[PDB]
RNA sequence: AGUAGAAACAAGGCC
RNA sequence: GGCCUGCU
């Protein structure tokens, strides 16, 4: 029943931002090529806090995920989900 | 079953059980049984009282129906049938008029020939067992008891049967008649046993209706309900949320602390303007005394005659002329108005015994110099609308004036002594305790030092003037009262004296709340020449009434003497405080003897005596343009008193607000000399806070010139 | 030479003679006219501390409200009212994990109380707005005037003599299409739902008299009655939970406050070791009252009420939905002067909505324009915040949370922070090993505060080394100071009456010598003094002098009479026995051994006409308001004497139209004093029951006559008449 | 008699009738403090403005037929006029020294039993005995003590209950004392206050007062003492003690 | 005019 | 001119 498509991701800069979109409570999380799932942000983990902001509009159905200050280490997939319901993630590459 | 009750019995009984069913408070829908039982128990109570008389004698006289007389005595009293709170006030009369013993539960009947109690019940079940049960209930009981079941049997201990057996007869028919009546409706199926002693309830408060939608609009922004809210709320666990938002919160929402050094605080800025004014109620260094040298205390003697017989006293009197204008009102109608006093005192003298109080002509001199006929008429909105002069009330900050060298003079000349006591305090106790003996020595210590001071005298002064001023404007509301200024005070040489600075005209003092104004004009006899600082008098009419002599090295002076003359006013609340300068006193001698207590509690000893007599110590009362002088403990006691005096006097909202917001600048600067590393969050803003309050007030410019000295000499 | 008091500081530390700074022996500032500016500026200045929220329109009274709850973040240190709920719920839980069971007691406690509480318990309070009339009144007036209301609109659970059954037909009025009200000018008026609904969500403003300490006046407001019993109820819960904090120091005195100042002074001092630095904040708070937000108060409570019975949670948190729908009254009116024509006129505030704004100065013009979208009915919506400490003891609870949160367990920091709140002040000691470990402690205090809608004023607030401070103007300098000052205005007759005018004045010496370190020779000062001003006050004169006085004929004539003049009371013209030793002894009994026996006899006479007395509450009490301070109420010794009478009251009711209120009271004062000649316990033990007067006291009548017949003067005449004229009266009452 | 007699007189009118019926013995206190007078603010302001009025006080109308009307020279003693909302009529504060001059005289010997507490602080005053003066620093310590110094063991409530049942024998209700020393307390103060007709509600004030324990909290040194706490203002000072020993001990 | 200071008094209402 | 009120 809840579909979910992310949008926002792509190739940036050191030190570059990055708004991923995703169109009950929500979460951003992240898959690096040589690992499982990492926990990002809910509605923040230790390795994110203050560089990455989570926020949602409920009347346009959507997730955001404002990410700045970004590192090399941010590179991997961003999924987004609902609490059971994934996204397939979208490539962000740093 | 309840249609029973409804056919059967009277109804004064139904009713009374249906107000010992509201009693207890359960309802009667759900159970009924228990009504009819009760009910019955009721009726036999009644059915076993009634129809039961006595006389003088005992043996009981029974009538069908009482006839009219005093022979209506009822031979049983019923217990029940009333509230609980009165049941057990009939039990407690009867224990205390008859001396009997108090039973713990309720009773039915009281008796006379046996002096008792009677405890009816008629049960479902057979006598030979509820009896007994209902013993056990009780305990140790003298009461008699006796009880009926349907099947017509009777019981009782002592086989006591306490009246006529056709009344028992009557019981038990009556008692048959509702078995074989419920025989036709036929409740067994329930009657015997029909309640069990249940006691339960739950409260309920439930939130419903507009109440509730008011609830779903008392919530944080994202919610839609209490129920969701109160889940949430439930479901709620700590999760460092506080640090997520305190690292997402701006960093420039900080406390910074701001060092506090010598440096640092700058001298207060004084307000700039036209210099400022006296506000005095009354003549504090210009003032001047005629004198008799009469042997009279204080409140002892007559107010007219003391002031006609000081003013006699003095000889030089001129015809009065305008010296110094008011600059805004009608200087004549002052000189008019100091005339007619003159005259009207030459009327009192002339006739036969001088009043307690006089009252004056209302003159039109009068009528303007007391504001008569100004305030402006009230009317309704609805009639004065199209009028462009109707306005508000002039509502804005006052206005702006600078401090002038006259109010430091005037305290420096308030802190002096003088050549008369103008304490005369009252008995006490005679001294029992050593302490006692301590404390009033220091008392007559600081009476000596404190008596001859100028403050006292405008404590006096003060509180005479305002004691005057309100009991007239009680007493005589509508009509101009006349009333001399009077001082009695005590020479050197012991002899008593009195002193009249002037008069005081009271008018038209309707005062209904306290913050009404009651206006009077004061005339007072001075020596000072107005033409030297006319700005002090801005709202003085001074004229010239006479010339003195008094005795000097230099030929004899022959001074002008002139009258100031000015329209004031007061109210409730200002002549209540002003009556109350006496405590002046209290604040500047209980500084005074903590300085002395706590000198003393390091050196294991009485210290006043030393530091009264050998004046070693002194503390900085003053500058000089030589530097800070320190002045004997004396000299203190006589500082503060004069500054409370001042602080009564000048007293106003901006002192107030100087007073506390220095005094938080004054803990700082003290905590900065105290080497305690003070520091501030917004300094300007307390600067700001300060400033403000310094309009035009010649006492807190005062203090604010004060503090900025205090402030250059501190800092060191 | 000129004389500076003030350079005295050079010498005498500030605090040692800072009763100097107090200028308490001038008249207070009062307020003159209308405090309807106030209450406009106070509004709109709680509406714009909130401005970021979010604009609503109640469904039910149809006004604007505003929600700040869970807004932006402050990024200015103004201050602001956008407290987070979930930082406001995590203080919480923190304050519950520190201090575990204290929710769960307090609410047993509360649950008993209020299911036990009774309807009478409201009686005893001051000024309450009654909307019956729409202008405040005595709370038993009030209640009164309510009472009756409901029972005239069909609402008569309140019968039921408990307050729970009260809150009932209060909220069960909130669902009637109509009620109605009496007016006299009697007409009945009827009042719908919307207006019913704003007429008991509505506040009376008024303006503060004799507040010393500031230039500026302010308001204050004065809640109905339909809303008091849920707030009794809350501030009932909220003192059982500050009584178990000792971080608290509202719900206690004066004496209790600085002993808890110096535990928490010498606690963390002491324990901070020589490598650890100390540093007390002197801390006022900003604008308290309109940035405390109801809806926080209503999460804290459901919050508190956790896992208790829902009816209880129900009606604690029935007040903060009223308050966060809370109207304020603007005021009196304001009043207009033309000189050209020499007129005046009052107009009432509630013209403010229409009125044009030609009449109006420029603030008061720009601040009508501001209010004027807030007018809902004559009253203006305030729901972003409190308006006078109605909560003054949850706005304490959610202090000492904000200073328990810093216990050293949840800073995670090497600095640390402690200390002792009371509503709108504290002192906070902040203990770090370095200045930056300090400064670091003391900026997330502060923005720890600001997250919960709490500022503080650095205007007012200075940062100094432990052992010097102030709070609530006591001064602690390695100690606290007698100040002294505080309690001068207390030394005057206080004009309860004579005698009780002697003990106050004589207990109130004897208490300032006890706590605020009073000297010997001060004390027998204050006592001459006191007895100068009593005596010119009461006309009552020694009688050997010859002070002639409206009262110095009869008093002389007493004094020429009496033998041992020395047994006189000062207020007959009789000399004063009392000193230091004797300032905790009655007049009446020092005096008792010297004293003539006629005079003695005459003096304490029962039968005296001048003696009244009501209830067991006002035997000895007297309420004094003391300066800077809410009112008080104190016990003081006195005998009952002819010297004890009631002075006369205001009398002014007999030009209103509000006239017929008198003939009430004295029909009631009436039955009142029946039933208490036939309930002689009416005054001591208020009665209870559900039956009515006449049923009590014509049955009373019936068994007394009875048993005082059996034994005492009536006779079988007068008992049979006593029992037929009890049916007459009876039938009467049928008829 | 007479009682049931205002009674009947009161039914008679319509209004007090309806007031009477429709009024409930809850409501007794509400109505009873239901009243138009607001409690003063400044008290002392308006005793220091109402005392320069003539008859500034309230009295019970039976004054007007025990005290003349005028004094010997002319001086209205009380007026006819009745207060606000009471049958009480306004008096001039003459009449309270005439009723100290020439008013009805009585027997004030029980007094002293009444007001017990009063007269036993004097007692143990009068017979105290003071000693020297001591001048060294006290450190003022804060402390919860009694001030009551004949607190007889029992609460508020607790008490409460014995001091109906001394005095109001009738309405205790349901209550009987178990604990024998309040049968004692009883007993003692019923045989004592047989005939006392001081009142029945200051009687019961004062035994409240006597025999409710209270405490308060107060800054001491040394002492702790119930007699030496009511002297605390005379023993202990800022830097001074004065050594003080009651008339009890 | 005067008192006073963010609004008032310098009598009110009723006939 | 006569009378009423002074915290309503």
Same mark, same amino acid.
């Given at each position: 029943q809840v579909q979910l498509q992310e949008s926002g991701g792509g190739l940036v800069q050191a030190g570059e931002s990055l708004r991923l979109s995703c169109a009950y409570g929500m979460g951003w999380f992240r898959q690096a090529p040589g690992k499982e799932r990492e926990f990002v942000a809910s509605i923040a983990m230790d390795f994110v806090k203050g560089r990455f902001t989570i926020s949602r509009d409920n009347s346009k159905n959507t997730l955001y995920l404002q990410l700045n200050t970004l590192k090399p280490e941010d590179t991997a997939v961003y999924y987004c989900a609902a609490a059971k319901y994934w996204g397939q993630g979208t490539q962000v590459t740093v | 079953?309840?249609?029973?009750?409804?056919?059967?019995?009277?109804?004064?009984?139904?009713?009374?059980?249906?107000?010992?069913?509201?009693?207890?408070?359960?309802?009667?829908?759900?159970?009924?049984?228990?009504?009819?039982?009760?009910?019955?128990?009721?009726?036999?109570?009644?059915?076993?009282?009634?129809?039961?008389?006595?006389?003088?004698?005992?043996?009981?006289?029974?009538?069908?129906?009482?006839?009219?007389?005093?022979?209506?005595?009822?031979?049983?009293?019923?217990?029940?049938?009333?509230?609980?709170?009165?049941?057990?006030?009939?039990?407690?009369?009867?224990?205390?008029?008859?001396?009997?013993?108090?039973?713990?539960?309720?009773?039915?009947?009281?008796?006379?020939?046996?002096?008792?109690?009677?405890?009816?019940?008629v049960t479902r079940r057979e006598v030979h067992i509820y009896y007994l049960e209902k013993a056990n209930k009780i305990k140790s009981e003298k009461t008699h008891i006796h009880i009926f079941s349907f099947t017509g049997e009777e019981m009782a201990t002592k086989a006591d049967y306490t009246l006529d057996e056709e009344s028992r007869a009557r019981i038990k028919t009556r008692l048959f008649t509702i078995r074989q009546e419920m025989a036709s409706r036929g409740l067994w199926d329930s009657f015997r046993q029909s309640e069990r002693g249940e006691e339960t309830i739950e409260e309920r408060f439930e939130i419903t209706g507009t109440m509730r939608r008011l609830a779903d609009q008392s919530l944080p922004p994202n919610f839609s309900s209490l129920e969701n809210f109160r889940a949430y709320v439930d479901g709620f666990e700590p999760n460092g949320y506080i640090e997520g938002k305190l690292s997402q919160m701006s960093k420039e929402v900080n406390a910074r602390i701001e060092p506090f050094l010598?440096?640092?605080?700058?001298?207060?800025?004084?307000?700039?303007?036209?210099?400022?004014?006296?506000?005095?109620?009354?003549?504090?260094?210009?003032?001047?005394?005629?004198?008799?040298?009469?042997?009279?205390?204080?409140?002892?003697?007559?107010?007219?005659?003391?002031?006609?017989?000081?003013?006699?006293?003095?000889?030089?009197?001129?015809?009065?002329?305008?010296?110094?204008?008011?600059?805004?009102?009608?200087?004549?109608?002052?000189?008019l108005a100091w005339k007619q006093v003159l005259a009207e005192l030459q009327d009192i003298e002339n006739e036969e015994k001088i009043p307690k109080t006089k009252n004056m002509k209302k003159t039109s001199q009068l009528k303007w110099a007391l504001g008569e006929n100004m305030a402006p008429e009230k009317?309704?909105?609805?009639?004065?609308?199209?009028?462009?002069?109707?306005?508000?009330?002039?509502?804005?900050?006052?206005?702006?004036?600078?401090?002038?060298?006259?109010?430091?003079?005037?305290?420096?000349?308030?802190?002096?002594?003088?050549?008369?006591?103008?304490?005369?305090?009252?008995?006490?106790?005679?001294?029992?305790?050593?302490?006692?003996?301590?404390?009033?020595?220091?008392?007559?210590?600081?009476?000596?030092?404190?008596?001859?001071?100028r403050a006292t005298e405008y404590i006096m002064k003060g509180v005479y003037i305002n004691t005057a001023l309100l009991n007239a404007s009680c007493a005589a509301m509508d009509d101009f009262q006349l009333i001399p200024m009077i001082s009695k005070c005590r020479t050197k040489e012991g002899r008593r004296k009195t002193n009249l600075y002037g008069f005081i005209i009271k008018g038209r003092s309707h005062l209904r709340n306290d913050t009404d104004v009651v206006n009077f004009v004061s005339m007072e006899f001075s020596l000072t020449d107005p033409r030297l600082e006319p700005h002090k008098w801005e709202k003085y009419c001074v004229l010239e009434i006479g010339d003195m002599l008094l005795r000097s090295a230099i030929g004899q002076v022959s001074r002008p003497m002139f009258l100031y003359v000015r329209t004031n006013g007061t109210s409730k609340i200002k002549m209540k405080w002003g009556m109350e300068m006496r405590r002046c006193l209290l604040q500047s001698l209980q500084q005074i003897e903590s300085m002395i207590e706590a000198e003393s509690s390091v050196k294991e000893k009485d210290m006043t005596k030393e530091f009264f007599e050998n004046k070693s110590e002194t503390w900085p009362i003053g500058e000089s343009p030589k530097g800070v002088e320190e002045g004997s403990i004396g000299k203190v006691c006589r500082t503060l008193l004069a500054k409370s005096v001042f602080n009564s006097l000048y007293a106003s909202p901006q002192l107030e607000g100087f007073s506390a917001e220095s005094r938080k600048l004054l803990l700082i600067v003290q905590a900065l000399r105290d080497n305690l590393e003070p520091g501030t969050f917004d300094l300007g803003g307390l600067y700001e806070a300060i400033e403000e309050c310094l309009i035009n007030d010649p006492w807190v410019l005062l203090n604010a010139s004060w503090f900025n000295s205090f402030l250059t000499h501190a800092l060191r | 030479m000129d004389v500076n008091p003030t350079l005295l500081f050079l010498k005498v530390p500030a605090q040692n003679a800072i009763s100097t700074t107090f200028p308490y022996t001038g008249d207070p500032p009062y307020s003159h006219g209308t405090g309807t500016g106030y209450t406009m500026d106070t509004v709109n200045r709680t509406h714009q501390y909130s401005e970021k929220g979010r604009w609503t329109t109640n469904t039910e009274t149809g006004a604007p409200q505003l929600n700040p709850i869970d807004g932006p973040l402050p990024e200015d240190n103004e201050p602001s009212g956008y407290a987070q709920t979930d930082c406001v719920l995590e203080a919480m839980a923190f304050l519950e994990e520190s201090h575990p069971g204290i929710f769960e007691n307090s609410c047993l406690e509360t649950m008993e109380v209020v299911q036990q509480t009774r309807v009478d318990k409201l009686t005893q309070g001051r000024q309450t707005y009654d909307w019956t009339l729409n202008r405040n009144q005595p709370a038993a007036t009030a209640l009164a005037n309510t009472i009756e209301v409901f029972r005239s609109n069909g609402l008569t659970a309140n019968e039921s003599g408990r307050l729970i059954d009260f809150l009932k037909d209060v909220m069960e009025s909130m669902d009637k299409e109509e009620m109605e009200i009496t007016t006299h000018f009697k007409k009945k008026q009827r009042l719908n739902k919307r207006s019913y609904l704003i007429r008991a969500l509505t506040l009376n403003t008024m303006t503060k008299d004799a507040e010393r300490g500031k230039l500026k006046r302010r308001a204050i407001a004065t809640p109905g009655m339909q809303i008091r019993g849920f707030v009794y109820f809350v501030e009932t819960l909220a003192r059982s939970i500050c009584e178990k904090l000792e971080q608290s120091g509202l719900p206690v005195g004066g004496n209790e406050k600085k002993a808890k100042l110096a535990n928490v002074v010498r606690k963390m001092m002491t324990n901070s070791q020589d490598t650890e630095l100390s540093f007390t904040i002197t801390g006022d708070n900003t604008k308290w009252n309109e940035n405390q937000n109801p809806r926080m108060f209503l999460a804290m409570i459901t919050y508190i009420t956790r896992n208790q019975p829902e009816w209880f949670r129900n009606v604690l948190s029935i007040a903060p939905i009223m308050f966060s729908n809370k109207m304020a009254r603007l005021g009196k009116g304001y009043m207009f002067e033309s000189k050209s024509?020499?007129?005046?006129?009052?107009?009432?505030?509630?013209?403010?909505?229409?009125?044009?704004?030609?009449?109006?100065?420029?603030?008061?013009?720009?601040?009508?324009?501001?209010?004027?979208?807030?007018?809902?009915?004559?009253?203006?919506?305030?729901?972003?915040?409190?308006?006078?400490?109605?909560?003054?003891?949850?706005?304490?609870?959610?202090?000492?949370?904000?200073?328990?949160?810093?216990?050293?367990?949840?800073?995670?920091?090497?600095?640390?922070?402690?200390?002792?709140?009371?509503?709108?002040?504290?002192?906070?000691?902040?203990?770090?090993?370095?200045?930056?470990?300090?400064?670091?402690?003391?900026?997330?205090?502060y923005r720890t505060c600001k997250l919960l809608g709490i500022n503080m004023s650095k205007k007012k607030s200075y940062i100094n080394r432990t052992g010097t401070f102030e709070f609530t103007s006591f001064f602690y300098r390695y100690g606290f100071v007698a100040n002294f000052s505080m309690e001068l205005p207390s030394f005057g007759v206080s004009g309860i009456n004579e005698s009780a005018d002697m003990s106050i004045g004589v207990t109130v010496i004897k208490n300032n010598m006890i706590?605020?370190?009073?000297?010997?020779?001060?004390?027998?000062?204050?006592?001459?003094?006191?007895?100068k001003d009593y005596r010119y006050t009461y006309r009552c004169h020694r009688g050997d002098t010859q002070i002639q006085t409206r009262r110095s004929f009869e008093i002389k004539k007493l004094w020429e009479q009496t033998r041992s003049k020395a047994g006189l009371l000062v207020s007959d013209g009789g000399p004063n026995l009392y000193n230091i030793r004797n300032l905790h002894i009655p007049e009446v009994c020092l005096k008792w051994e010297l004293m003539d026996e006629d005079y003695q006899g005459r003096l304490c006479n029962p039968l005296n006409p001048f003696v009244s007395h009501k209830e067991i509450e006002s035997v000895n009490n007297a309420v004094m308001m003391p300066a800077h301070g809410p009112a008080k109420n104190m016990e003081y010794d006195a005998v009952a004497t002819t010297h004890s009478w009631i002075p006369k009251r205001n009398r002014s009711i007999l030009n209103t139209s509000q006239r017929g209120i008198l003939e009430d009271e004295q029909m009631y004062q009436k039955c009142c004093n029946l039933f208490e000649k036939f309930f002689p316990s009416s005054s001591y033990r208020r009665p209870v029951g559900i039956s009515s007067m006449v049923e009590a006291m014509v049955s009373r009548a019936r068994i007394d006559a009875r048993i005082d017949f059996e034994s005492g003067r009536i006779k079988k005449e007068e008992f049979a008449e006593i029992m037929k004229i009890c049916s007459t009266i009876e039938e009467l009452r049928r008829q | 008699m007479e009682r049931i007699k205002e009674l009947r007189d009161l039914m008679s009118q319509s209004r007090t009738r309806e007031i009477l019926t429709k009024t409930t013995v809850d409501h007794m206190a509400i109505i009873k403090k239901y009243t138009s007078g607001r409690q003063e603010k400044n008290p002392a302001l308006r005793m220091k403005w109402m005392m320069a009025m003539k008859y500034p006080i309230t009295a019970d109308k039976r004054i007007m037929e025990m005290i003349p009307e005028r004094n010997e020279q002319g001086q209205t003693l009380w007026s006819k006029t009745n207060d606000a909302g009471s049958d009480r009529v306004m008096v001039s504060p003459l009449a309270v020294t005439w009723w100290n001059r020439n008013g009805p005289t009585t027997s004030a010997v029980h007094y002293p039993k009444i007001y017990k507490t009063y007269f036993e602080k004097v007692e143990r005053l009068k017979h105290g005995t003071f000693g020297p003066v001591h001048f060294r620093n006290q450190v003022k310590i804060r402390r919860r003590v009694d001030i009551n110094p004949g607190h007889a063991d029992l609460s508020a409530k607790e008490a409460q209950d014995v001091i109906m049942e001394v005095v109001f024998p009738n309405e205790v209700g349901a209550r009987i004392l178990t604990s024998e %020393?309040?049968?004692?307390?009883?007993?003692?103060?019923?045989?004592?206050?047989?005939?006392?007709?001081? %009142?029945?509600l200051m009687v019961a004030y004062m035994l409240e007062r006597e025999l409710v324990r209270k405490t308060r909290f107060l800054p001491v040194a040394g002492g702790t003492s119930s007699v030496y706490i009511e002297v605390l203002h005379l023993t202990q000072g800022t830097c001074w003690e004065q050594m003080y020993t009651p008339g009890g001990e």
């Open positions: - | 079953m309840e249609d029973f009750v409804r056919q059967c019995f009277n109804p004064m009984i139904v009713e009374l059980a249906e107000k010992a069913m509201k009693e207890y408070g359960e309802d009667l829908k759900i159970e009924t049984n228990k009504f009819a039982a009760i009910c019955t128990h009721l009726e036999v109570c009644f059915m076993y009282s009634d129809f039961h008389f006595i006389n003088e004698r005992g043996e009981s006289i029974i009538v069908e129906s009482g006839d009219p007389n005093a022979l209506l005595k009822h031979r049983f009293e019923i217990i029940e049938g009333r509230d609980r709170t009165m049941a057990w006030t009939v039990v407690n009369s009867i224990c205390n008029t008859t001396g009997a013993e108090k039973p713990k539960f309720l009773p039915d009947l009281y008796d006379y020939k046996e002096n008792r109690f009677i405890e009816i019940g010598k440096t640092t605080p700058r001298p207060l800025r004084l307000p700039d303007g036209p210099p400022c004014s006296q506000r005095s109620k009354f003549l504090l260094m210009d003032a001047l005394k005629l004198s008799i040298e009469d042997p009279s205390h204080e409140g002892e003697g007559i107010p007219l005659y003391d002031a006609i017989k000081c003013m006699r006293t003095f000889f030089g009197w001129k015809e009065p002329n305008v010296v110094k204008p008011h600059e805004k009102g009608i200087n004549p109608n002052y000189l009317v309704d909105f609805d009639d004065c609308k199209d009028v462009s002069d109707l306005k508000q009330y002039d509502s804005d900050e006052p206005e702006l004036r600078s401090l002038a060298s006259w109010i430091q003079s005037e305290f420096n000349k308030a802190c002096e002594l003088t050549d008369s006591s103008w304490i005369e305090l009252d008995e006490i106790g005679e001294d029992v305790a050593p302490i006692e003996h301590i404390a009033s020595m220091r008392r007559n210590y600081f009476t000596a030092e404190v008596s001859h001071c | 024509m020499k007129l005046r006129t009052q107009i009432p505030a509630e013209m403010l909505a229409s009125i044009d704004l030609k009449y109006f100065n420029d603030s008061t013009r720009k601040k009508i324009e501001k209010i004027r979208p807030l007018l809902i009915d004559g009253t203006a919506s305030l729901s972003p915040g409190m308006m006078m400490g109605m909560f003054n003891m949850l706005s304490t609870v959610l202090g000492v949370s904000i200073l328990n949160l810093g216990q050293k367990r949840y800073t995670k920091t090497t600095y640390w922070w402690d200390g002792l709140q009371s509503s709108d002040d504290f002192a906070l000691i902040v203990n770090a090993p370095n200045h930056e470990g300090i400064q670091a402690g003391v900026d997330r205090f706590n605020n370190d009073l000297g010997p020779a001060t004390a027998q000062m204050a006592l001459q003094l006191f007895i | %020393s309040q049968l004692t307390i009883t007993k003692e103060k019923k045989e004592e206050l047989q005939d006392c007709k001081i %009142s029945p």
